[PDB]
């Protein structure tokens, strides 16, 4: 998938003027509207369409076979089709049966495994396991400052925008010759 | 009012008419109305298909907010009318 | 004596914008028997509560020689035959 | 609006249109009329500052475009022998 996550901001497309002006009045009003009609039209169509006859009914069956508490744990070197070999925390290799609900292809060696807390099974699979302490590390509020407010660094600053910006806005520009962008 | 005349495809045609009318006037009045009824009295019954020609012209009335408003309507769009 | 069966399943509107303002001047432009004194048939039920507070229906041709305060069957006076509206349903 | 905007020549040029707007907005033509008859012809440069706001804002205006009408005759002098 390799999901080009963004920063999930920009919710600001930034006020024009910055001296104090009916002109900012207006534009920052327009900005609350289109959030607030954004806020009214998500909270009305999920209070319509009445789609109540939800869950369907065998997502609903799945949840009830795997229990409460759910474990985290290593999937380990898989030995049949329906069967394979589980790590807890403790280091205690569990040699479970996996069920129906897994996707037999995601599940490779080293792939954290859920499992099922009284009879130890391989429920599902796990694709998040990033480490709490590396996931801190992504910015997701994008810092409000623009090149403009920068100056007079012009050549030190088109240097950086030629190995950050360019070579994914116009990449044709380097293949044309063959040189690989520089990282 | 004269295209009230007929089946929920009058409907239809009232939502296009305004839309095919304000190409880029941005407002809030007509944008706002269409958009909550359009969606709020047709996906409930058999008739429907009329929901995405409102949203489907959001750009219209609102295409050139003075190249503003558009990214505030790439938000709502893709967050609403996809996910 | 109701169904009382209603639904809306709406949502109410909060457009709050500077549109307020056209709302408004285009509103404006568009804008310019009881019971306890009733009656009530013989073998009708009486609640102890009006047993004592009842009226006595003069206008056909009886009266009850019990006293009336009480409930319960009281047999009225005997006054002469040919009365109207003999029924015994 | 005649005196106090351009009261030194200064940035208060940029509020002129905006009490101009907040008031009198039907009689926003005549309101500048009586503005314009003497401080724009004073000063025939300072009415580009006054088409540069106009014009960044035409595209913000009224749900009904009667201000977007307004701002469109209002600017026909400004960009006129003026």
């Given at each position: 998938k390799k999901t080009k996550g963004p920063d999930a901001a920009s919710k600001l497309p930034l006020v024009t003027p910055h001296t104090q002006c009916r002109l900012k009045l207006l534009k920052l009003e327009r900005i609350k509207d289109y959030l607030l009609m954004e806020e009214e039209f998500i909270r009305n169509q999920e209070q319509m369409?009445?789609?109540?006859?939800?869950?369907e009914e065998e997502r609903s069956k799945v949840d009830d076979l795997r229990g409460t508490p759910m474990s985290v744990g290593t999937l380990e070197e898989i030995i049949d089709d329906n069967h394979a070999i589980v790590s807890t925390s403790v280091g205690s290799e569990h040699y479970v049966s996996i069920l129906?609900?897994?996707?037999?292809?995601?599940?490779?060696?080293?792939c954290s495994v859920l499992l099922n807390?009284?009879?130890?099974?391989?429920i599902g699979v796990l694709m998040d396991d990033t480490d709490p302490l590396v996931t801190v590390?992504?910015?997701?509020?994008?810092?409000?400052?623009?090149?403009?407010?920068?100056?007079?660094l012009d050549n030190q600053i088109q240097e950086i925008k030629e190995s950050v910006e360019l070579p994914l806005t116009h990449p044709e520009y380097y293949e044309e010759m063959g040189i690989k962008p520089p990282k | 009012a004269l295209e009230v005349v007929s089946e929920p495809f009058r409907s239809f045609a009232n939502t296009l008419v305004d839309v095919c009318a304000y190409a880029?006037?941005?407002?809030v009045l007509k944008v706002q109305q269409l958009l909550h009824i359009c969606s709020e009295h047709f996906?409930?019954?058999?008739?429907?298909?009329?929901?995405?020609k409102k949203e489907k012209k959001?750009?219209?009335?609102?295409?050139?907010?003075?190249?503003?408003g558009a990214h505030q309507g790439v938000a709502v769009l893709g967050i609403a009318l996809i996910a | 004596e109701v169904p009382k069966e209603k639904e809306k399943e709406k949502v109410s509107t909060?457009?709050?914008?500077?549109t307020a303002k056209a709302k408004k001047k285009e509103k404006e432009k568009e804008k310019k028997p009881e019971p306890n004194f009733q009656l009530l048939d013989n073998p009708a039920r009486v609640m102890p509560a009006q047993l004592k507070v009842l009226t006595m229906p003069?206008?056909?041709r009886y009266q009850p020689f019990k006293p009336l305060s009480i409930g319960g069957i009281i047999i009225l006076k005997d006054t002469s035959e040919d009365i109207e509206e003999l029924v015994e349903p | 609006a005649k005196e106090w905007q351009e009261l030194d020549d200064a940035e208060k040029v940029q509020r002129e249109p905006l009490l101009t707007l907040v008031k009198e907005i039907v009689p926003y033509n005549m309101a500048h009329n009586a503005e314009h008859e003497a401080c724009d012809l004073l000063m025939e440069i300072e009415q580009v500052d006054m088409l540069e706001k106009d014009i960044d804002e035409?595209?913000?205006?009224?749900?009904?475009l009667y201000l977007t009408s307004c701002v469109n005759y209002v600017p026909e002098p400004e960009n006129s022998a003026l």
């Open positions: 369409k009445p789609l109540e006859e939800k869950q129906s609900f897994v996707d037999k292809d995601l599940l490779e060696p080293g807390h009284k009879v130890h099974a391989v590390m992504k910015v997701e509020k994008a810092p409000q400052e623009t090149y403009a407010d920068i100056g007079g | 880029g006037s941005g407002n996906d409930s019954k058999e008739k429907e298909e009329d929901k995405d959001d750009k219209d009335k609102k295409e050139a907010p003075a190249d503003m | 909060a457009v709050l914008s500077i003069e206008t056909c | 035409n595209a913000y205006a009224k749900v009904c």
